[PDB]
RNA sequence: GUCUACGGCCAUACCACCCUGAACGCGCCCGAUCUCGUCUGAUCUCGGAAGCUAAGCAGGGUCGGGCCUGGUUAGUACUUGGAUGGGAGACCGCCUGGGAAUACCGGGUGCUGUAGGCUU
RNA sequence: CAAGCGUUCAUAGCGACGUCGCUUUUUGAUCCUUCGAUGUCGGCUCUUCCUAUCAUUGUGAAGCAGAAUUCACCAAGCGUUG
RNA sequence: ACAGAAACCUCCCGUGGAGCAGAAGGGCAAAAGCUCGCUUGAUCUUGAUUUUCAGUACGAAUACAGACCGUGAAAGCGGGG
RNA sequence: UUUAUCCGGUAAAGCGAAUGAUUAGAGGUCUUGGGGCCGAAACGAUCUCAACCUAUUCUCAAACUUUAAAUGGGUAAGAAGCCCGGCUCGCUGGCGUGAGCCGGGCGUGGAAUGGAGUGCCUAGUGGGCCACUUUUGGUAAGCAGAACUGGCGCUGCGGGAUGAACCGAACGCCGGGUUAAGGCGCCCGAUGCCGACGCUCAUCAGACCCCAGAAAAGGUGUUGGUUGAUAUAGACAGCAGGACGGUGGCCAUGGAAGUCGGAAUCCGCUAAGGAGUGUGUAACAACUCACCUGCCGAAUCAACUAGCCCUGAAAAUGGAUGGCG
């Protein structure tokens, strides 16, 4: 049997990562959080105050609560089958903003922007995203050589 | 004394290396990884003849050993004392365990049969990849046929498989041998005893002005 | 009479055979958990709204009749 | 040189039964709706469609279908799904009755849809019942293996056509 | 890879364009194979060992057959081969006397499983290339090679062995 | 072109040495009356403005070490799936896809934010 | 495999350092079978079978002159006691 | 100077190769290390959550809020280590 | 499954990057030593070995890591969403934040599939076993213990002779067709192909995933290659001549004039003779072999490598590619 221990294995994973021990760069705690805002928890081990546990690191999941110094945030954690949606403190040090949800709130500016133009023409655009399609029946040119002719080469033992 | 190399074969069990996770090892029982004219110079040796292996497999410390002595005696021969140098190119790392020998007297009354099944150590083996070298024998270009026979004596005394074969380099160094009399004048190569600097296009300029002076 | 001392073998499959359900969430979630002097406080906003309808009603007639008349100055 | 048109419809047989199939697996072979061994549906191609069949590739056989090929399909073994029953497409008011607010009214005019891709592909290749298609007379080279090692597996370019003809 | 009777199916092909190479070199190989399918297949398995390249990050742009400009010429073949026995791989030349250089490598291919238990999927075909009458090393294509070639059919045994299965009047042989 | 004050990302910014710095500043620097601190005005605190770029700092320089990025190593090592493939076995080959790391070669060497100067 | 022993000579006979196997007449490991019980040591008697041959038939080897003796082959026919 | 491989003093180098009560593992440099001065946040009080988990306790922990304070120019930090 | 986007420390790699092991030389009185040898002694000379370190090099790590995959884990892909307008506050603040409210303004936001949501009672079970891959003890096990999926238990059918678990495939009762895995001399349905192309002869032949049998090592048995040789200036093989002189060469004498052994060690006659391959002889001789000739007329020789068959290969009621063959 293995040990319950709140840290155990994490030997390896909140661990600074290289050339980075010191001094926490002063931009991570002045970034603001707000409720609604999606956030990926990551661990750090210079701070011990505050951190998550094992379990949520590298997941995400939206912010429900802003203290002083942490931010409650409710993730999904999975426990043989039933997923619960459990609310945890995490200060902030071990926190980011996840970029996961901002490419669509530029492909919605942009599809909001691309409606009410082209509303004054009545001109139906393709606002959906489309899956890479098939590509396309073309032209290949060569110029004045035929192709190059490869062979496979012989062996010889290298060593 | 040891169960026959059989049992100790295959590589089954991660490396266990002697550390001070297992201690009381007993010393391993090679102990001179190269013999010969180890004071040669590569300017006098042109032929790296080796003897690789051909299947992924474990090498008793006891078998390295008769591997190289047999090697030493159809070497210093044909050839003498000085014209070889023999290199032993796999040090017996890994250590070999042994559960308790299930040691009984008489008929018996217990032993516990498998409780504690972890045994102690017993020796040392090499672990070997294909296409990995084990022995490697140098002399002059004079004498290939030397090699071949020196090297063909070992096999007789390694489990497995391990083809024979001449290498394309200098001696021991790295440097494809129908290239080093042209970079080591012009000095892209420096003689250094055994091996051979190469020396780059990138340091301090004073670096070369030792050099082509 | 040793055993087997553990075992995750078909459990995948039991915890799996009603099909793992990601928590059905509905708009308004329970606001226990915030901090006191958030609700401490908003309740009193919440307490006081109307206390201040008059205004909000008027200024709704307002932007509803001038876009009463936005809509008609279009027509 | 030409290089011609990457084919945009796939026509997908499963080749081998339901036992010993791993869980991904089965969940693809649900979303093609290749439910029973031996039956086969028309497969639109497209990045995520491909990369769905590299991932059940040892239990069906793929290919580009020509139009011989679609004609025989819809029409000797062309079942429509009405109130979600298989009910045999013997009339034409019938194909209209489901999909005529696409423009599709006719027998015909469903195998536009399924060779020209077209914009309803959607609602045409979803009200046919998956075809249930014979056994291959003639027999099979391997089921177990792919098509390039002499087996039966995986994609045939334009070579499912053969395989077509002896499985109606 | 399996067999059938080979064909000799050329394929080209160049590695997809890229924003900074706009014109890829093409590469002709000369495959080797029973039909489009698998030759398009080998293709892919010749060009990841010499180039960079791969059946995703690339597209076959020719696929077609080039078949005998002299098929009713008997020729001497020779073909140089790179196999995988059970212990390592070798290289090797050897030569056959068809008159077509697919049917020429088919009897090669037979001959490895033959003579050597050498499956399709370990041999690789370096290079076919058709031979005069000198330069042949085999003796058994020399021995052809002549004007008045001359045999008998010496102990001509009978096939239809089950056409009359009974009969009165023990066979012949002899022709 | 550049500095000073407060900075962000934290070596393309470091380190070693070499060369050059107009004017503003930064500094070295000159004192211990008061404030303050020491075994010591050495540091810290304070009052200064006689000197000098000697150094820090700035700016460059080195077939410089380091870091940052590319190439190669290499479609190699490894691997998701697959077979009534090979092999006494160790292991190995192929099919369907993904795809590294050194040594070895190149290129680069701090970008900027706000507020104030100086070159009027 | 072969460093050596064998006056000389690797291999008549041997054979170190190593290495590959067979065997179930040793002991172990294991706990699959039997706890509504398969009588759990030897000896006596009696049969049959194996050959990893001690003798005898036929042979090849010897550092076999004879005698004696080791080494090996076809061989389990018949012996192997008080 | 006595003074030696070791006392004490001084300069230079010193990314941590020391130290952080203990096992290891993480973390730490005008610090979390060492030296001083001031102290009792090791105090009083509701809940919420994490950790083992049945998602029960106990233990341990994390964020808050309410009091009384300690400290510091102060921002803050502190309800044992 | 795509498209974005974070998370990761395993395989691999590396150790001229840390930590830990570790070989070799070159370089260093680094330091220093402990022995020496030449020195009274001397960083003097020459060594030596120890330890360190300056460029190097051999090999490693589950409880090491610069790097660093594959498979894989999170979210996100809109109406509970955007965009305006306005009220409320005991929180927050130079103003604003922020949250909460009211009021209006605007629709398919990647592919493919399918009707979804939710509450009550509740039986049986809580000895498990096997296989691919991964993997821990163990030498190994039809052994003990995990992962991942799949099965068997709970389940028959075709196939594997037989058989839980392998291969195919999952069973309402039937007629026709067709297949899968397997097969098709006879048992026994199907080759009663004028089937292809080869390989091998076994006095122990060989004959199909699980699976039920063999290894290193050999074998001019035969068949392919690979590489290197030799040759019409006539080889190879065969049959004929010489195989000597300077020379009891030198060491070794116990005998080695060529020959138990070794340092060696080259010329003359040259055509060619090694200061010798061996036979042996106390030593020679005598013989022979390299080397070179005489005769013959064109292909020959050597080392490796792999396929099949042989050797290696020994057990007990008679005997099992299922049998016949
Ligand atoms: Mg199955
Ligand atoms: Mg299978
Ligand atoms: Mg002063
Ligand atoms: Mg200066
Ligand atoms: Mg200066
Ligand atoms: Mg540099
Ligand atoms: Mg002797
Ligand atoms: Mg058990
Ligand atoms: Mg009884
Ligand atoms: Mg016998
Ligand atoms: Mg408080
Ligand atoms: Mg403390
Ligand atoms: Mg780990
Ligand atoms: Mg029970």
């Keep these: 049997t293995n040990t319950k221990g709140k840290r155990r294995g994490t030997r390896y994973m909140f661990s600074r990562p290289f050339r980075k021990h010191g001094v926490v760069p002063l931009a991570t705690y002045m970034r603001i959080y707000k409720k609604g805002d999606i956030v990926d928890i990551k661990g750090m081990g210079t701070v011990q105050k505050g951190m998550p546990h094992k379990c949520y690191h590298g997941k995400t999941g939206r912010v429900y609560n802003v203290t002083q110094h942490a931010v409650g945030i409710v993730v999904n954690k999975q426990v043989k089958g039933k997923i619960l949606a459990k609310r945890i403190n995490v200060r902030i040090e071990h926190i980011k903003h996840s970029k996961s949800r901002?490419?669509?709130?530029?492909?919605?500016?942009?599809?909001?922007?691309?409606?009410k133009e082209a509303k004054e023409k009545g001109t139906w655009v393709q606002l959906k995203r489309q899956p890479a399609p098939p590509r396309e029946a073309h032209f290949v040119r060569t110029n004045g050589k035929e192709p190059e002719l490869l062979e496979p080469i012989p062996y010889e033992f290298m060593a | 004394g040891r169960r026959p190399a059989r049992c100790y074969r295959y590589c089954k069990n991660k490396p266990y290396p002697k550390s001070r996770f297992c201690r009381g090892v007993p010393d391993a029982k090679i102990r001179i990884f190269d013999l010969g004219?180890?004071?040669?110079?590569?300017?006098?040796?042109?032929?790296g003849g080796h003897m690789v292996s051909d299947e992924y497999e474990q090498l008793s410390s006891e078998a390295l050993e008769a591997a190289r002595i047999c090697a030493n005696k159809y070497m210093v021969k044909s050839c003498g004392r000085d014209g070889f140098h023999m290199r032993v190119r796999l040090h017996p790392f890994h250590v070999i365990r042994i559960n308790?020998?299930?040691?009984?007297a008489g008929a018996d009354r217990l032993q516990t049969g498998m409780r504690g099944a972890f045994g102690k150590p017993q020796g040392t083996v090499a672990r070997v990849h294909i296409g990995q070298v084990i022995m490697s024998i140098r002399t002059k270009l004079q004498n290939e046929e030397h090699v071949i026979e020196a090297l063909r004596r070992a096999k007789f005394k390694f489990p497995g498989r391990q083809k024979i074969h001449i290498s394309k380099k200098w001696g021991f160094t790295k440097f494809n041998a129908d290239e080093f009399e042209n970079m080591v004048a012009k000095k892209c190569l420096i003689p250094d005893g055994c091996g051979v600097k190469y020396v780059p296009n990138h340091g301090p300029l004073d670096k070369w002005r030792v050099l082509h002076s | 009479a040793k055993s087997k001392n553990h075992t995750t073998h078909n459990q995948s499959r039991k915890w799996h055979r009603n099909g793992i359900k990601k928590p059905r969430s509905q708009r308004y979630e329970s606001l226990k958990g915030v901090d006191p002097k958030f609700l401490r406080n908003m309740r009193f906003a919440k307490k006081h709204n109307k206390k201040g309808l008059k205004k909000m009603q008027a200024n709704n007639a307002k932007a509803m009749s001038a876009r009463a008349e936005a809509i008609k100055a279009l027509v | 040189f030409y290089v011609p048109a990457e084919p945009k419809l796939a026509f997908v047989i499963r080749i081998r039964g339901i036992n010993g199939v791993s869980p991904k697996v089965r969940k693809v072979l649900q979303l093609l709706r290749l439910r029973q061994i031996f039956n086969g549906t028309f497969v639109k191609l497209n990045k995520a469609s491909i990369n769905?069949?590299?991932?059940?590739?040892?239990?069906?056989?793929?290919?580009?279908?020509?139009?011989?090929?679609?004609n025989e399909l819809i029409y000797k073994r062309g079942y429509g799904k009405i109130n979600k029953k298989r009910i045999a497409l013997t009339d034409n008011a019938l194909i209209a009755r489901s999909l005529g607010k696409y423009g599709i009214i006719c027998m015909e005019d469903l195998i536009h849809?399924?060779?020209?891709?077209?914009?309803?592909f959607k609602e045409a290749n979803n009200f046919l019942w998956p075809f249930k298609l014979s056994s291959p007379r003639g027999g099979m080279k391997k089921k177990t293996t792919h098509f390039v090692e002499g087996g039966d597996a995986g994609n045939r370019e334009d070579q499912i056509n053969r395989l077509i003809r002896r499985m109606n | 890879?399996?067999?059938?009777?080979?064909?000799?199916?050329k394929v080209v092909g160049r590695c997809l364009p890229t924003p900074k190479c706009r014109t890829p070199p093409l590469y002709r190989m000369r495959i080797f194979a029973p039909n489009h399918v698998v030759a398009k297949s080998r293709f892919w398995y010749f060009v990841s060992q010499?180039?960079?390249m791969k059946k995703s990050s690339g597209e076959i742009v020719y696929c077609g057959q080039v078949f005998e400009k002299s098929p009713l010429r008997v020729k001497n073949f020779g073909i140089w081969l790179r196999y995988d026995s059970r212990s390592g791989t070798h290289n090797m030349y050897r030569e056959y006397r068809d008159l077509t250089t697919a049917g020429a490598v088919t009897q090669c291919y037979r001959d490895m499983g033959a003579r050597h238990r050498?499956?399709?999927?370990?041999?690789?075909?370096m290079k076919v290339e058709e031979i005069a009458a000198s330069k042949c090393r085999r003796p058994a294509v020399k021995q052809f090679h002549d004007s008045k070639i001359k045999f008998p059919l010496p102990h001509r045994v009978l096939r239809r062995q089950h056409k009359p299965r009974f009969t009165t009047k023990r066979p012949n042989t002899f022709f």
Excluded at chain 2, 37 to 47: S, Y
Excluded at chain 4, 55 to 64: N, S
Excluded at chain 4, 115 to 120: D, I, L, M, N
């Design chain 2, 100 to 104: 308790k020998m299930l040691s009984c």
């Design chain 5, 50 to 52: 010499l180039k960079k």
């Design chain 5, 1 to 9: 890879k399996a067999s059938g009777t080979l064909r000799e199916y």
């Design chain 2, 37 to 47: 004219r180890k004071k040669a110079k590569v300017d006098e040796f042109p032929l």
């Design chain 1, 102 to 115: 901002d490419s669509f709130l530029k492909r919605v500016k942009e599809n909001d922007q691309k409606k």
């Design chain 4, 52 to 70: 769905m069949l590299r991932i059940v590739e040892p239990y069906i056989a793929w290919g580009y279908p020509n139009l011989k090929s679609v």
């Design chain 4, 113 to 120: 849809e399924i060779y020209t891709v077209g914009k309803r």
């Design chain 5, 118 to 125: 050498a499956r399709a999927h370990s041999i690789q075909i």
